[PDB]
Amino acid sequence: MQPKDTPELRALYKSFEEESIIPLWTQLGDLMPIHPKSKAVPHVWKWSTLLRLARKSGELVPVGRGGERRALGLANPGLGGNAYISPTMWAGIQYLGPRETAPEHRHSQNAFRFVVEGEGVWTVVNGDPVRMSRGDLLLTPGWCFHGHMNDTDQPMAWIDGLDIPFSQQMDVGFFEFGSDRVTDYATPNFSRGERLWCHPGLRPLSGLQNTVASPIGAYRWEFTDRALTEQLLLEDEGQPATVAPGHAAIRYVNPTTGGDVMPTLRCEFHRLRAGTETATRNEVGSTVFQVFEGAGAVVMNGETTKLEKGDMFVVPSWVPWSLQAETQFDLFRFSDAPIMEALSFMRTKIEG
Amino acid sequence: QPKDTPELRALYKSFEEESIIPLWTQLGDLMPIHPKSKAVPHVWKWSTLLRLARKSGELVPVGRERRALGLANPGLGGNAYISPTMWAGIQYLGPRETAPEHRHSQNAFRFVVEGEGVWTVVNGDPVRMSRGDLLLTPGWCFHGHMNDTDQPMAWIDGLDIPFSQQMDVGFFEFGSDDYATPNFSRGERLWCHPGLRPLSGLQNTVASPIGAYRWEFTDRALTEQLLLEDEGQPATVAPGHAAIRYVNPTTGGDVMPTLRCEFHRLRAGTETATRNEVGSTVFQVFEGAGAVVMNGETTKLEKGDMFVVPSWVPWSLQAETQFDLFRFSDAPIMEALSFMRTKIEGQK
Amino acid sequence: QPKDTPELRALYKSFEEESIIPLWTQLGDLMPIHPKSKAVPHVWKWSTLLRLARKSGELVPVGGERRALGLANPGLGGNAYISPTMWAGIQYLGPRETAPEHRHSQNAFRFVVEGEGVWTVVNGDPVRMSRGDLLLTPGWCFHGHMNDTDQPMAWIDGLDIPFSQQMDVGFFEFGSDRDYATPNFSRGERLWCHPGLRPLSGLQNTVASPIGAYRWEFTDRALTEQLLLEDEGQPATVAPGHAAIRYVNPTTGGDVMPTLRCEFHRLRAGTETATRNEVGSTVFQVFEGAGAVVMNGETTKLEKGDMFVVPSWVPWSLQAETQFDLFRFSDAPIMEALSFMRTKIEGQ
Amino acid sequence: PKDTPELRALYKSFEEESIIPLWTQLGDLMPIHPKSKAVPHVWKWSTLLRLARKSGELVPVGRGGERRALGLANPGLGGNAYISPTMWAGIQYLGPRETAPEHRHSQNAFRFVVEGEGVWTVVNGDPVRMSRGDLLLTPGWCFHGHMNDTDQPMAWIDGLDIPFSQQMDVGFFEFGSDTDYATPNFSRGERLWCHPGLRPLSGLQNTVASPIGAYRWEFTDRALTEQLLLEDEGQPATVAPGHAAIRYVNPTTGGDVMPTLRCEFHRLRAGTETATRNEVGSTVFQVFEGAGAVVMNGETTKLEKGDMFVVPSWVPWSLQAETQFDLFRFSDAPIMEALSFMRTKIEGQ
Ligand SMILES: [Cl-]
Ligand SMILES: [Cl-]
Ligand SMILES: [Cl-]
Ligand SMILES: [Cl-]
Ligand SMILES: [Fe+3]
Ligand SMILES: [Fe+3]
Ligand SMILES: [Fe+3]
Ligand SMILES: [Fe+3]
The answer to whether B190 and B119 have CB atoms below 8 angstroms apart is no
Q: What gap in Å lies between CA B242 and CA B240, rounded to an integer?
A: 7
Cβ atoms of B231 and C253 within 8 Å: the answer is no
How far A270 CA sits from the closest chain D CA (Å)?
A: 9
* Integer Cα distance of D59 and D56 in angstroms: 7
Helix axes A47-60, B9-17, angle to 10 degrees: 160
D166: three-class secondary structure by DSSP:
helix
Angle between helices A7-19 and B46-59 (to 10 degrees): 160
Ligand 6 centroid vs B72 CA: distance in angstroms? 18
What is the CA A155 to chain-centroid distance, rounded?
22
Report yes or no on D55 lying in a domain.
yes
Q: How many residues does chain C have?
A: 348
Judged by its nearest atom, the ligand closest to the C-alpha of residue D317 is 1
Reported as type and span, the H/E element at residue D263 is strand D262-268
Closest CA to C326 of C290, C273, C279: C290
Q: Which residue among A73, A342, A345 sits closest to B23, beta carbon to beta carbon?
A: A73
Q: Please give, rounded to a whole number of angstroms, the shortest distance from the CA of A249 to a CA of chain D.
A: 6
Q: Are C344 and C276 in contact (CB under 8 A)?
A: yes
Question: Which H helix or E strand runs over B335?
Answer: helix B331-336
Phi, psi values for residue B254, rounded to 5°: -75, 160
CA of B103 to the centre of ligand 5 (A): 41
Helix D45-54 with C7-17: angle, nearest 10 deg: 160
Rounded to whole angstroms, how far apart are CA atoms D343 and C194? 34
The residues, any chain, with a CB within 8 Å of residue D4's CB and separated by 6 or more, are none
Distance of alpha carbon A89 from its chain centroid, rounded?
Answer: 7
Q: Is D169 helix (H, G, I), strand (E, B) or coil?
A: coil
In a domain, D25, yes or no: no
State the amino acid at position D8 in one-letter form.
R
Residues with Cβ within 8 Å of residue C85, at least 6 apart in sequence: C160, C162, C163, C280, C281, C331, C334, D168
In a domain, B220, yes or no: yes
Which region, left, alpha or beta, applies to residue D12 given φ > 0 means left and ψ of -120 to 50 means alpha?
alpha
SS3 D114: strand
Contacts of D233 (CB under 8 A, 6+ apart): none
* CA C245 – CA C266 distance, rounded (Å): 9
Min distance A9 CA to chain B CA atoms (Å): 7
Mutation target to probe the B interface, by most B beta carbons within 10 A, among C109, C136, C179, C190 is C190
Q: Are A316 and A259 in contact (CB under 8 A)?
A: no
Query: Which residues on D lie below 8 Å from C259 (Cβ)?
Result: 339
What is the per-residue DSSP string for A42-91? -EEE-HHHHHHHHHHHHHH--BTTTBTS-EEEE--GGGTT---SSSS-EE
- A265 falls within a domain: yes
Residue D233 domain flag:
yes
Dihedral angle computed from the Cα positions of residues C250, C256, C259 and C260, in that order, rounded to the nearest 10 degrees: -150
Task: Return the half-sphere exposure (C-beta side, CA atoms, 13 A cut-off) of residue A285.
Answer: 25
Question: 3-class SS at C177?
Answer: coil
CA D237 to chain A, closest CA, distance in angstroms equals: 6
Q: Strand C87-93 relative to strand C68-71: parallel, antiparallel, unpaired? A: antiparallel
Strands of D109-166, DSSP E: 109-115, 117-123, 126-131, 135-138, 144-148, 154-160
Quote the radius of gyration of chain D (alpha carbons, Å).
22
Q: Render A124-178 in DSSP notation, one character per residue.
A: EETTEEEEEETT-EEEE-TT--EEEEE-SSS-EEEEEEE-HHHHHHHT---EEEP
Q: In the Cβ-directed half-sphere of A318, how many Cα atoms lie within 13 Å?
A: 16
The helix or strand, by DSSP H or E, that contains position D224, with its residue range, turns out to be: helix D217-232
CA distances from A284 to A35, B162, C168 (A): 9, 16, 51
Q: Looking at chain A, which subunits does it touch, using at least 3 CB pairs closer than 8 Å as the criterion?
A: B, D
b/e sequence B294-318, b meaning 16+ C-beta within 10 Å: beeeeeebeebbbbbbbbbbbbebb
When computed from its CA atoms, the radius of gyration of chain C, rounded to whole angstroms, is 22
Length of chain D in terms of residues written: 349
User: What is the Cα C30 distance to its own chain's centre?
Assistant: 27
Domain of D323: which CATH number? 2.60.120.10
Instruction: Tell me the one-letter amino acid at A276.
Output: T
Three-state secondary structure call for residue B34: coil
Nearest by Cα to D328 from D282, D289, D287, D270: D287
- Asked if residue C268 lies in contact with residue C239, where contact means CB atoms within 8 angstroms, the answer is no
Cα of B242 vs centre of ligand 2, distance in Å, is: 11
Pairing of strands B143-147, B116-122: antiparallel
CA separation (Å) from D113 to A1, A175, B238, D116?
77, 52, 60, 7
Provide, as residue numbers in chain B, all residues whose Cβ is less than 8 Å from the Cβ of A5. Answer: none
Residue D284 CA to residue D41 CA, distance in Å, equals 10
Query: Chain A interface residues facing chain D, Cβ-Cβ under 8 Å?
Result: 192, 195-206, 208, 210, 214, 216, 219, 223-224, 226-227, 230-231, 233-234, 239-243, 249-253, 255-258, 268
B270 to A6, B273, B323, B324, C225: CA distances (angstroms): 49, 10, 9, 12, 41
Which amino acid belongs to residue D266?
H
Residue of D nearest to A190 (CA): D226
User: CB C199 to CB B250 under 8 A?
Assistant: no
Cβ–Cβ under 8 Å, residues D128 and D109: no
Resolution (A): 2.9
Give the strand order in the sheet containing C343-345: C298-302, C291-295, C316-320, C276-278, C343-345
Entry field: residues in chain B? 348
Nearest CA in chain A to D219: A199
Interchain touch C–A (≥3 Cβ pairs closer than 8 Å): no
Breaks in chain B (C to N over 2.5 Å), named by the residue before each, are 64, 177
User: Which element (helix H / strand E) includes D55?
Assistant: none
Chain C residues at the B interface, defined by Cβ less than 8 Å, are 187, 189-201, 203, 205, 209, 211, 214, 218-219, 221-222, 225-226, 228-229, 234-238, 244-248, 250-253, 263
Q: Which residues of C touch B234 (CB under 8 A)?
A: 187, 201
Q: Do D64 and C24 touch (CB under 8 A)?
A: yes
Residues of D with a Cβ under 8 Å from any A Cβ are 188, 191-202, 204, 206, 210, 212, 215, 219-220, 222-223, 226-227, 229-230, 235-239, 245-249, 251-254, 264
* Residue B109, domain member (yes or no): yes
d(CA D155, CA C138): 46
Contacts of C197 in chain B (CB under 8 A): 213, 217-218, 221, 244-247
Query: From A231, which residue of chain D is nearest by alpha-carbon distance?
Result: D192
| Bridge-based pairing state of the strands D299-303 and D277-279 | unpaired
The four Cα atoms D160, D166, D171, D175 give a dihedral, to 10 degrees, of 70
Q: Round to whole Å and give the CA distance between A18 and A304.
A: 49
Would you give the DSSP letter of residue C88?
E
Ligand 4 geometric centre to CA of B24 (Å) = 34
Q: How far apart are CA C220 and CA C217, in angstroms?
A: 5
Class of residue B138 by CB neighbours under 10 A (exposed 0-12, middle 13-18, buried 19+): buried
The crossing angle, in degrees rounded to 10, of helices D8-17 and C46-57 is: 160
Q: Is D41 annotated as a binding residue?
A: no
Provide the b/e sequence for D275-313 (b: ≥16 CB within 10 Å).
eebbbbbbbbbbbbebbbebbbeeeeeebeebbbbbbbb
Q: Tell me which residues of chain B have a C-beta less than 8 Å from any C-beta of chain C.
A: 186, 188-200, 202, 204, 208, 210, 213, 217-218, 220-221, 224-225, 227-228, 233-237, 243-252, 262
3-state secondary structure C1-70: CCCCCCHHHHHHHHHHHCCEEECCCCCHHHCCCCCCCCCCCEEECHHHHHHHHHHHHCCCCCCCCCCEEE
Helix (H, G, I), strand (E, B) or coil at A205: helix
With beta carbons under 8 A apart, name residues in chain B contacting A175: 29, 31-33
Residue of B nearest to C211 (CA): B195
Which chain C residues are closer than 8 Å to B247 by Cβ? 196-198
Inter-residue contact B107 to B169 (CB < 8 Å) = no
Q: How far apart are CA C84 and CA C280, in angstroms?
A: 9
The experimental method behind these coordinates is: X-ray
Residue A322 CA to residue D135 CA, distance in Å, equals: 42
Type of residue numbered D322: E
What is the domain range of residue A210? 33-352
Nearest-angstrom CA–CA distance, A271 and C9: 63
Which residues are within 8 A (CB) of C313 and not within 5 positions of it... i.e. 6 or more apart?
C34, C35, C36, C37, C277, C278, C279, D169
**B318 close to B279: Cβ distance less than 8 angstroms:** no
From CA D222, how far away is CA A326, in angstroms rounded?
Answer: 40
CA dist list (Å): B230 to A113, B240, B242, B271: 57, 9, 12, 18
Whole-number Å distance between alpha carbons of A120 and B176: 65
DSSP per-residue codes, B177-233: ------SS-HHHHHH-STTEEEGGG-S--SS-S-SEE-HHHHHHHHHHHHHHHHTT-
Q: Which residues pair with B89 in a beta bridge?
A: B70, B157
Ligand nearest to the CA of A270: 4
Nearest neighbour of D197 by CB, restricted to A205, A226, A252: A252
The two counts, helices (H) then strands (E), for chain C are 6, 25
In this complex, the residue of A195, A206, A252 whose CB is nearest that of residue D198 is A252
Split into its structural domains, chain C has a count of 1
**Cα–chain-centroid distance for residue D344?**
20
Residue C116, strand partner residues: C130
What residue type is assigned to position A198 of the chain?
C
Contacts of B64 (CB under 8 A, 6+ apart): A2, A3, A25
Type of residue found at A308: E
Which ligand is closest to the CA of A111, given by its number? 5
For residue D5, is it within any domain?
A: no
CA distance C24 to chain B (A): 43
* Composition of chain B by helix, strand, coil, percent to 5: 20, 35, 45
* Helical (H) or strand (E) element with B17: helix B9-17
Handedness of CA C15, C20, C22, C28 (dihedral sign): positive
Whole-angstrom distance, CA of residue D111 vs CA of residue D166:
20
Q: List chain C residues with CB under 8 Å of B210.
A: 195-196
How distant is the Cα of A329 from the closest Cα of chain D, in angstroms? Answer: 17
Burial class (CB in 10 A: 0-12, 13-18, 19+), D241: exposed
Contacts of B325 (CB under 8 A, 6+ apart): B263, B264, B265, B266, B283, B284, B285, B286, B317
Q: Is B130 exposed, middle or buried (0-12, 13-18, 19+ CB in 10 A)?
A: middle
Instruction: Please tell me the distance from the alpha carbon of residue B164 to that of residue B29, in angstroms, as a whole number.
Output: 25
Residue D45 three-state SS: helix
Please list the alpha-helical segments (H only) found in chain C: 7-17, 46-57, 161-166, 187-192, 216-231, 332-337
Q: Which residues lie closer than 8 Å to A178 by C-beta, 6 or more apart?
A: A103, A104, A105, A106, A145, A147
C-alpha distance from residue A80 to each of A72, A84, A86, B19, D80 (Å) = 17, 9, 11, 11, 76
> Has D105 been labeled as part of a binding site?
yes
Let me know: does A269 contact A332? Beta carbons within 8 Å: yes
Q: From edge to edge, which strands make up the β-sheet containing B297-301?
A: B297-301, B290-294, B315-319, B275-277, B342-344
Q: How far does the centroid of ligand 5 lie from the alpha carbon of residue B257, in Å?
A: 30
C-alpha D211 chain-centroid distance: 18
Q: What is the DSSP string of D25-41?
A: S-GGGS-SS---SS--E
To probe the interface with D, which of C3, C23, C45, C105 has the most D CB atoms within 10 Å?
C23
Using CA atoms, how far residue C31 sits from B166, C2, D66, D136, in Å, is: 59, 18, 15, 20
Instruction: Examine residue D178 and say whether the peptide bond preceding it is cis (omega within 30 degrees of 0).
Output: yes
Please indicate, yes or no, if residue B51 is contained in any of the structural domains.
yes
DSSP bridge pairs for B122: B125, B143
Q: Residue A190 region, left (φ>0) first, then alpha (ψ -120 to 50), else beta?
A: beta
